[PDB]
Amino acid sequence: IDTINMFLQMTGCTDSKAMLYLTYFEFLITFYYLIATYASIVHFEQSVTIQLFALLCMLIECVILLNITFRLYHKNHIREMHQYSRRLGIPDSYRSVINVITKYHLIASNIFVVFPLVYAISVYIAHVELCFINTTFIYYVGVLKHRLETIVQTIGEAFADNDEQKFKYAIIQHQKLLSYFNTMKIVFSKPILLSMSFNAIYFGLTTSFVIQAIRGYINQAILSICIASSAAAVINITIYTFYGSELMDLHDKILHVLFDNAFFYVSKSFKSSILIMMTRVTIPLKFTVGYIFTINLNLLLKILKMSYTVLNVLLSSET
Amino acid sequence: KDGLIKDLWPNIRLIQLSGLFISEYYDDYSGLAVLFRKIYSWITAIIIYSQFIFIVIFMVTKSNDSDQLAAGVVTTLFFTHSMIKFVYFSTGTKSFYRTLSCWNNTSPHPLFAESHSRFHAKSLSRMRQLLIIVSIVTIFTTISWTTITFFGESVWKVPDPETFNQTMYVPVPRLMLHSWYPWDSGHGLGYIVAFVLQFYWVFITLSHSNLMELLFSSFLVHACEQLQHLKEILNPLIELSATLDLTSNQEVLVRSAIKYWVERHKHVVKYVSLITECYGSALLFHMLVSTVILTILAYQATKINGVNVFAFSTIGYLMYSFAQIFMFCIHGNELIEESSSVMEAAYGCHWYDGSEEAKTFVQIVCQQCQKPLIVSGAKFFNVSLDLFASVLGAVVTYFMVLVQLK
Amino acid sequence: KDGLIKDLWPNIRLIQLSGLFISEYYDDYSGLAVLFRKIYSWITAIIIYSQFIFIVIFMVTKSNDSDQLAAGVVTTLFFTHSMIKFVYFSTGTKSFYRTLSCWNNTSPHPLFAESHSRFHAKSLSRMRQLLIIVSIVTIFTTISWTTITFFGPVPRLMLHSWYPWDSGHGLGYIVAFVLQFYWVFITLSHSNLMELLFSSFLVHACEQLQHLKEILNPLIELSATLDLTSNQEVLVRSAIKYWVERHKHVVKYVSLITECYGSALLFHMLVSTVILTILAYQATKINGVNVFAFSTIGYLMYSFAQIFMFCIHGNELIEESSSVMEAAYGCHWYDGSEEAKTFVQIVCQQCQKPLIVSGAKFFNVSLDLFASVLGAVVTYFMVLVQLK
Amino acid sequence: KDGLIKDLWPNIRLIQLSGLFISEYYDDYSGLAVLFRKIYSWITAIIIYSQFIFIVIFMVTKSNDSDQLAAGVVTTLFFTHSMIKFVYFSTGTKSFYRTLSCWNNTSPHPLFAESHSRFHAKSLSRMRQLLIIVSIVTIFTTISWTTITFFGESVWKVPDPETFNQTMYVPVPRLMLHSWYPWDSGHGLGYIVAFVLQFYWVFITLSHSNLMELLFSSFLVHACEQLQHLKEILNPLIELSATLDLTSNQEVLVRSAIKYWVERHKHVVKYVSLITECYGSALLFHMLVSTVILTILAYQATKINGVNVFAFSTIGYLMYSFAQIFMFCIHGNELIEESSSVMEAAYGCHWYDGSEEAKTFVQIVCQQCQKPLIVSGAKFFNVSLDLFASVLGAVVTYFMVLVQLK
Ligand SMILES: CCCCCCCCCCCCCCCCCC(=O)OC[C@H](COP(=O)([O-])OCC[N+](C)(C)C)OC(=O)CCCCCCCCCCCCCCCCC
Ligand SMILES: CCCCCCCCCCCCCCCCCC(=O)OC[C@H](COP(=O)([O-])OCC[N+](C)(C)C)OC(=O)CCCCCCCCCCCCCCCCC
Ligand SMILES: CCCCCCCCCCCCCCCCCC(=O)OC[C@H](COP(=O)([O-])OCC[N+](C)(C)C)OC(=O)CCCCCCCCCCCCCCCCC
Ligand SMILES: CCCCCCCCCCCCCCCCCC(=O)OC[C@H](COP(=O)([O-])OCC[N+](C)(C)C)OC(=O)CCCCCCCCCCCCCCCCC
Ligand SMILES: CCCCCCCCCCCCCCCCCC(=O)OC[C@H](COP(=O)([O-])OCC[N+](C)(C)C)OC(=O)CCCCCCCCCCCCCCCCC
Ligand SMILES: CCCCCCCCCCCCCCCCCC(=O)OC[C@H](COP(=O)([O-])OCC[N+](C)(C)C)OC(=O)CCCCCCCCCCCCCCCCC
């Protein structure tokens, strides 16, 4: 909750009033930089190394502008989803991974700051929201996993006393978990698409800039951006894919814990509920966004295969 | 007219007035009227096919360079969509009649009549909005095609008869389509007649090629709205079966409501099957032509440069060819999603505190409504947004490959 | 002979008279007739293998150019389909026998006799139509292979083969002519007959499942409790049990089909991939209409037709086998009793698994696979054109 | 030593004697024997990694042409498979012990003891067949590697210090693998010790990789045989509950048999999950290395001319990589299909001619065994024949594109 409370405070679910306007104040500072950068090549005269660096700057600030209100859009959804998540925590492994991510992002940000204030304004604001969406997703997937574990434990307890009331409670818990998963899909459908497109376009930009690098046009130039932003894109897309694929194995636990010998001693009303929930949980929890994208390691492998094919084609054409 | 016919009356009237080979849904079934309508439709078909034959004639007899050949093939394949759809609706009216007659005597249950009426109104609104969008797009396309003729120099590359490998730019009449004519079209009455004929041909062919897709999209929209209504009434349907402090009246009411829900879902499934049967070969032919269209258009965009008539032509052709695919791809994907979500809607109700009949009904619904209803295109591919995404990715990859190899 | 044997009687007759190694379905079992049959089959096989090694040796000892080598390889790969099919049917005859004998003693229920007879008649009509189509296509291509060789010092034989004796002048020319005619006819007939048998196998199961779907509707109307007795419940139980046996028989028959013609399909696809790739390479050097262009177009058309003929039927079976749950929903299960409801639930659970024919587990034989092959070949052809 | 440990005893003994870091399944637990085993394993690891580092440094410091660089990279990536597998089993013995201890106290019901014994014998036969095939392949590969180096001109391309852009072929000692050595490996005692060290290193690395792959295949084979036994005993399991002309003894017997079946299926599912957890990362790393190996090999195959040492070496590398992939792909596909067929086997029983308990058991079995059991490597992909087919197709199409462009 070190940064989950930060989610809450900049989103507005808490008593923070000026901090909410401070979030919108961040939307204006980037807006100042975005319009100024867009006017560089339009009016100002500069060399090739400037606009391309400005293009990386404006593309980065485009993400910054396309993340603040982009995340503030689902204010009520995030509030309700946090309220559901307040009851039960998250696994210790998820706590460790979010701690590691938030420690790395803060430390890695300072590397570029002191690498060589006028330009450092946007350096720190970029890194915080890069970790921000990479921590919210893991926290709110971990709470879902913990609730799934609680549901499995409740079902296992229900298969010891033939308790209709306990099984009804477990079914209600499963329905609430499904509703929360739908809410999570609604919340995260858009930022995941933004991150995936960002990854694709920066992969293309970096591979073109890397093949046109050794020639020497980029001495003390965009290479720092093409390293840092590409690394951030890679880590966020990897986190998203991994924790969207972890949700594909949540229903298997229920599907395997429902198959119990006690099912042959219940009173013919327990059996119908068992069979109905088995039918429901046969299909795993699929994280479908954009009507075409299934967020998982298979999607990550597809992206990697596309990148590898592009690299192979470019290398074959060059040689 | 009641049911889907009254639901789609503007579409039916538009296709009737266009000149397509449709015979039913009349009110003046007399010999003279049927003779006049048959004569008008045959004249329209003859005019359209003669103009198309002239267009393809001005593709091999006057095109020498590869660029001119590509432009001619692009135009011919662009109008091949309308050419195929015209004959398909000419020789396939029975499937359309069967599809339109599926919802003939269906009547909502008295308990869920209000919900059915609300979803019917929503379906009407969606259908009208889609028709308005289609009409606006067709009108804008025709207007732009008419306008762009006068923004360029009508010069055709022709080899010099005196030299060996030298060409000039012979003047050509300013016409919307490069077509050959038995009579001269350089100036005067011939020029005006040719321009009028080409304008009418473009408008009517676009009207047919858009009306077919509009009909398919309207069918899918109605199916989706019916499925949404079925999902919506499931919670009150199950709550009817609660054992709160079962009488014979309650039991018979629950049985009747379950029967009505099952009959409506079976009607939806059969309607989607009829949609697949009626619009399989159309989608197959459309995609087969559009594959070549997009390949040649990507090749043309490879040589694009600056802003000019050629750039605008390539951009417009690409945009229209992608929009035509997307128009039915989005509706196929929406139908797949709405058919797959019925299981979640059924499982998300208060069925645990219900009767054994309600639990059995929920179990059977969860069992069947597991794999989504798919409008397969001639059982070759699955019409959804996956197909459109794959097409866009393939086109972008081909464009990148060409721009790298050139 | 009755059942599947009688249904496939003309195709079986063609197989046993075409020289393929068949030991059953003969009503003249003596101590010598088997000997004449064996010697005739052996002579057919030896002349076929002799012609194959002759064309192979001519290709390997008379090709100096890449185009000539490609054409020779095209001919060899076009005939190797029948080459492998002959040995496949000669060796794995037990799987074919088991698939034929799967439907050997089945007896229809008294209530569904008319439906079973109608669907059996429809299956027979489809089988005869497919046989007619295959025979017509084989005859047409056989006559085409000889009408093309006259439109070309190399003798005008339709096959460029090597022989121990001269084939330029004399009776050797006509004897090579007739031998090559017979070889082409026999090889094409074998290759088409195997696919004919597989397609008949794929259509019989589809007809049986359509019959099951049709009889599902009155199955629960019998059990409807509208104004059961002991006799009614006994009849419903017997009819449900018969339906379950019929579905199990269909599933086992499809499994037998898959086990029977999986490796042969895999080998056919493996050869088809290479010949299609080489044909796509060959089609780039087109110089208008001529003998070479006609030959390339014919090879491509036959290669596509051979795969598509069974791909469409496999896809039809896959698409139709999933409709049994639709029929189970169609029949008014809400009017049935608890036993009927449980049977419907179990049937739906089973039917949520489409009957899929697998080519030795590597791929699913369907129009999806046909479209994948078409796309790969077209993409390769386009890439070759762009690079050239 | 009973159960899967006794089942895999030859493989366990080979792993113990092969220098891999293992600590359990020993009968000499003494303060001296364990120390000697630790020193032996440490010496083996040190020698292996020293030889690998020598290969890497030679490849880095003595590669001038792209062909030489490609050959060195192919060899280094070929042996990084064994490097990764060794370092993976060294630090991951706990998961392997957990997987091996799953079938610890399992016992079969008296009714199905004959079927259990028959399928146990079948599993033993399959495991012994797999071990024999693995040993034969490894020994043959080592022998071929030893023979091939004697069948060519041992010369290395070097640039000319006398001229600007000229080169020659300098004599190089005839070794099993090209590598750097601190001592004088040119001839004599240094040459023979280098050759024997190379032979031992190649044999031991191939053994280290093949033992792990055979262990995974044996795990999958045992799971498949257990699933086969469960499928087979279904006929007597459901026949026992038949109501044909129930007594208390028969009822308790069928209940006990049903409990045994449920426990056995749960055990099999947990065992498959344990296999997936234990041997997923290794498969992912193997595929990551193998895709690059196959890309470079497809590039190198386009340079094959006639029949010679280079062509034979490239063919051998490709064959070994494809065999390594196929070895686990086939077993993954077998497990997938043989777990998916359980529903068909259960439905094919005489479940109608049985009690309501039998009907419910069949219903729940069909409901549960609908999703096939899948072994996945770190959730990146599903280990099956589809992965092997995709890899083969990608390699073939890359080779075709390269040979057509070149
Ligand atoms: C290529 C240039 C991209 C430049 C990007 C720079 C920023 C430009 C701003 C627009 C770009 C997109 C921003 C995020 C999306 C904003 C709109 C939105 O939320 O749309 C949601 C919508 C869908 O809404 P949804 O998913 O929120 O709704 C789902 C919820 N139900 C079902 C209930 C309705 O998606 C789209 O409109 C599609 C996005 C298309 C554009 C992005 C495609 C990225 C592809 C990258 C390459 C991938 C390669 C591998 C692919 C493997 C599989 C094929
Ligand atoms: C999914 C879309 C992704 C796009 C790529 C997909 C792969 C390609 C699939 C379609 C096949 C393409 C066939 C050739 C067209 C492209 C030619 C090209 O690139 O060069 C432009 C060529 C010329 O360009 P060029 O590449 O020769 O370059 C020379 C240019 N100069 C001389 C200026 C240097 O265009 C033409 O020649 C005009 C068109 C030729 C006539 C085409 C008639 C089509 C007949 C259809 C027969 C059946 C086809 C079935 C298709 C469906 C199969 C699934
Ligand atoms: C709210 C929901 C509804 C809204 C969303 C859906 C709206 C519909 C979307 C598609 C509408 C398409 C309308 C135009 C179709 C015209 C087709 C046609 O025939 O055109 C060829 C024709 C010409 O074809 P021609 O050249 O063969 O005809 C001329 C003939 N001679 C040579 C003899 C004179 O017209 C055009 O060229 C079109 C001109 C206008 C094109 C405007 C395109 C947009 C502006 C540029 C692109 C900017 C964004 C993209 C950036 C780059 C991306 C790659
Ligand atoms: C209801 C079902 C209806 C459909 C079923 C019936 C139709 C089946 C269609 C497939 C038929 C396949 C068999 C016939 C072909 C013979 C195959 C064969 O062996 O040929 C090689 C043989 C010759 O092989 P050869 O070359 O080895 O023999 C001569 C050898 N030398 C030269 C050395 C002596 O015959 C041919 O060449 C036949 C070619 C006939 C082509 C006639 C049509 C040409 C134009 C077609 C369309 C052109 C492209 C149009 C666009 C693309 C298509 C839409
Ligand atoms: C040809 C490409 C370059 C050479 C090959 C590169 C592949 C990786 C080589 C490094 C060795 C990795 C294994 C050694 C250590 C294994 C220890 C272990 O248990 O690991 C599993 C554990 C996970 O544990 P677990 O919970 O999965 O359990 C493992 C199972 N037991 C318990 C039995 C051990 O950690 C890892 O996932 C590995 C972390 C270190 C990874 C090494 C760094 C390199 C990563 C790849 C770099 C290249 C990526 C390219 C991507 C595509 C780009 C376009
Ligand atoms: C029921 C199931 C039954 C079993 C079915 C499955 C069977 C097994 C399937 C896989 C087969 C694997 C076979 C071994 C693969 C070896 C892989 C390998 O490491 O290869 C690379 C190495 C060699 O590649 P290299 O390049 O690393 O070695 C060169 C070393 N330097 C550079 C120092 C010179 O192995 C080989 O030697 C492979 C050669 C092919 C094997 C052919 C057998 C004959 C060998 C002697 C040839 C002698 C003639 C040569 C000259 C001719 C006259 C000029």
3-state helix/strand/coil string of B182-211: CCCCCCCHHHHHHHHHHHHHHHHHHHHHHH
Q: Domain count of chain D?
A: 1
- B404 in contact with C, Cβ within 8 Å: no
Cα–Cα dist A198/A201, whole Å: 5
- Put simply, the answer to whether C315 touches B371 (Cβ < 8 Å) is no
Distance separating alpha carbons of residues D298 and D398, to the nearest angstrom: 7
Decide: helix, strand or coil at residue D27. coil
Collapsing DSSP to helix, strand or coil, D398 comes out as helix
Helix H or strand E segment including D167: strand D167-171
Distances (CA, A) of C295 to C147, C203, C283, C290, C291: 11, 32, 10, 9, 6
Give the closest of B262, B370, B380 to C367, CB-based: B380
Distance CA C239, CA C228 (A): 15
To the nearest 10°, the Cα dihedral for B354, B360, B363, B369? -110
Measured distance CA(A99)–CA(B156) in Å, rounded: 69
Paired tokens of D332: 């993954």
Burial of D61 (0-12, 13-18, 19+ CB in 10 A): exposed
| D232 within 8 A of D122, measured Cβ to Cβ | no
CA dist A34 and D402 (Å) reads 44
Helix B113-148 and helix B189-239: axis angle, to 10°?
A: 160
Establish how many alpha carbons lie within 13 A of residue C266's alpha carbon, considering only the half-sphere containing its beta carbon.
Answer: 13
Q: At how many degrees (to 10) do helices C66-91 and C171-223 cross? A: 50
Burial degree of C234 (CB within 10 A; 0-12, 13-18, 19+): exposed
Count of CA atoms in the C-beta half-sphere (13 A) of D249: 0
State how far the Cα of D93 lies from the Cα of A121, in Å rounded to an integer.
Answer: 50
Amino acid letter, residue B134: V
DSSP state of D103: T
* Residues B366 and C348 sit within 8 Å (Cβ to Cβ): no
The minimum CA-CA distance between A149 and chain B, rounded to whole Å, is 20
Q: Is residue D116 part of a domain?
A: no
Question: By the 8 A CB rule, do D279 and D216 touch?
Answer: yes
Alpha-carbon B220 to chain mean position: 10
Distance of CA A229 to the CA centre of its chain: 16
CB B337 within 8 A of CB B400: no
Q: Please tell me what DSSP assigns to residue B369.
A: T
SS3 label, residue A289: strand
Residue with tokens 């364990």: D34
CA neighbor of A162 nearest in space, from A253, A261, A278:
A261
Q: Which DSSP symbol is given to C58?
A: H
Tell me if D64 is assigned to some domain: yes
Q: Which of C264, C254, C110, C251 is nearest to C195 (CA)?
A: C264
D257: closest chain A residue by CA: A261
Sign of CA dihedral D362, D363, D367, D368: negative
Q: Is the CB of C148 under 6 A from ligand 4?
A: yes
In whole angstroms, how large is the CA radius of gyration of chain C? 25
Distances in whole angstroms, Cα of residue D49 to Cα of each of D46, D69, D288 = 5, 21, 20
Which atom of ligand 6 is nearest to D144's Cα?
37
Closest ligand to residue B324's CA: 3
For residue D118, is it within any domain? no
Q: A155 with A162: CB under 8 angstroms?
A: no
Which helix (H) or strand (E) covers residue B158, if one does? strand B155-159
CA-CA distance, C239 to C223, in Å (whole number)? 10
| CA–CA separation, A304 and A51 (whole Å) | 29
Q: Are C158 and C145 in contact (CB under 8 A)?
A: yes
Quick one: angle between helices C367-387 and B385-405, nearest 10?
20
CB C322 within 8 A of CB C347: no
Question: Other C-beta atoms within 10 Å of C164: how many?
Answer: 7
Rounded CA gap, C249 and C255, in Å? 10
Using the Cβ of B362 and the Cβ atoms of chain A, whether some distance falls under 8 Å is answered with yes
Cβ separation D352–C240 shorter than 8 A: yes
Diameter over CA atoms, chain A: 83
Cα→Cα distances D271→B99, B380, D232, Å: 52, 40, 19
Among A residues 273-292, those touching chain D with beta carbons less than 8 Å apart: 274-275, 278-279, 282
- The DSSP code for D159 is E
Query: Are the beta carbons of B151 and B126 closer than 8 angstroms?
Result: no
Domain presence at residue D113: no
Query: Which tokens go with D79?
Result: 């042996």
Name the token pair of B393: 């990715």
* Triad D391, D395, D396: Cα angle to 5°: 115
Q: Which amino acid is at B312?
A: F
The answer to whether C180 and C72 are in contact (CB under 8 A) is no
Look at chain D and count its residues.
406
Provide the greatest CA pair distance for chain D: 103
Burial letters A98-108, b for 16+ CB under 10 A, else e:
beebbeebeeb
**C282, C385 contact by CB (below 8 A):** no
Q: Quick count: other Cβ atoms within 10 Å of Cβ D251?
A: 14
Q: What are phi and psi of C364, to 5 degrees?
A: -95, 120
Of D290, D377, D330, nearest in space to D74 by CA? D290
Distances in whole angstroms, Cα of residue C137 to Cα of each of C143, C305, D227: 10, 10, 47
To test the pocket of ligand 2, the residue of B59, B73, B80, B292 to mutate (highest count of ligand atoms within 8 Å of its CB) is: B292
Q: What angle (nearest 5°) sits at the alpha carbon of residue C190, between those of residues C184 and C193?
A: 130
- Read off the tokens for B156: 């055709």
Extract the tokens encoding B188: 């005067």
Task: Report whether C246 contacts C208 (CB < 8 A).
Answer: yes
Phi, psi of B382 (to 5 degrees): -105, 120
- As a whole number of angstroms, the distance between CA D345 and CA D342 comes to 5
Closest residue by Cα to atom 36, ligand 2, is B70
Tell me the Cα Rg of chain A. Answer: 24
Phi-psi region of D63 (alpha: psi -120 to 50; beta: other; left: phi over 0): beta
User: Does A283 sit within 8 Å of B370, measured CB to CB?
Assistant: yes
Shortest CA distance to D116 belongs to which of D233, D21, D31, D211? D233
Q: Is the dihedral of CA B4, B10, B13, B16 positive or negative?
A: negative
Selection from D334, D359, C321 nearest residue A271 by Cα: D359
Tell me the C-alpha to C-alpha distance, in Å, between residue D119 and each of B194, C308, D1, D125: 83, 41, 20, 10
Q: Where are the alpha helices (DSSP H) in A114-222?
A: 121-158, 164-211
DSSP state of C364: B
3-state SS class at D170 = strand
User: Is there a contact between D381 and A298 if contact means CB atoms under 8 Å apart?
Assistant: yes
Contact indicator for C332, C224 with CB cutoff of 8 Å: yes
8 A C-beta contact, residue C224 and residue C335: yes
Which amino acid is located at A141 in the chain?
Answer: V
Work out how many CB contacts closer than 8 A connect C with D: 50
Are A45 and A35 contacting, i.e. CB atoms less than 8 angstroms apart? Answer: no
- What resolution does the deposited structure have, in angstroms? 3.5
Is D364 an 8 Å CB contact of chain A?
yes
Domain hosting residue C127, numbered range: 4-104+112-387
DSSP string, A36-55: HHHTHHHHS---HHHHHHHH
| C-alpha triplet C218, C221, C224: angle, nearest 5° | 160
At residue D279, the 3 state secondary structure works out as coil
Instruction: Return all residues near C166 (Cβ < 8 A) that are at least 6 apart.
Output: C172
Gap from CA of C145 to ligand 4 centroid (Å): 9
CA distance D228 to D341: 10
CB burial of D184-197 (b: ≥16 within 10 Å; e: otherwise) equals ebeeeeebeebbeb
Is D119 a member of any domain?
no
Element (H, E) at C302: helix C291-321
Q: At what angle do helices A121-158 and A18-38 cross, to 10 degrees?
A: 130
Instruction: List the beta bridge partners of residue B381.
Output: B377
**Other CB atoms within 10 Å distance of the CB of residue A256:** 17
Quickly count: other Cβ atoms within 10 Å of residue B265's Cβ: 18
Task: Please write down the long-range contacts of C3-8, taking CB distance under 8 Å and 24 or more positions apart.
Answer: C3/C103, C3/C104, C3/C105, C3/C106, C4/C100, C4/C101, C4/C102, C4/C103, C4/C104, C4/C204, C5/C100, C5/C104, C7/C120, C7/C123, C7/C124, C7/C127, C7/C200, C7/C204, C8/C100, C8/C127, C8/C197, C8/C200
Q: How far apart are CA B405 and CA C384, in angstroms?
A: 13
Residue D341 lies in a domain: yes
The whole-angstrom separation of Cα B397 and Cα D139 is 46
**H or E stretch including B157?**
strand B155-159
List the chains bordering chain A where 3 or more Cβ pairs fall under 8 Å.
Answer: B, D
User: What is each CA distance from D147 to B32, B286, D131, in whole angstroms?
Assistant: 96, 60, 24
Q: Which residues pair with D157 in a beta bridge?
A: D169
A301-319 core/surface letters (b: 16 or more CB in 10 A; e: else) = bebeeebeebebbbeeeee
Measured between alpha carbons, how far is residue C57 from residues C52, C165, C166 in Å? 9, 14, 15
Query: Where are the domains positioned within chain A?
Result: 97-318
Residues of B in contact with A167 (CB under 8 A): 352
C-alpha dist (Å) from residue B178 to A180, B82, B296, C343 = 60, 18, 18, 67
Spatial CB neighbours of A76, under 8 Å, sequence gap ≥ 6: none
**Contact by Cβ (8 Å): C246, C108:** no
DSSP string, C78-115: HHHHHHHHHHHHHH-HHHHHHHHHHSSS----STTHHH
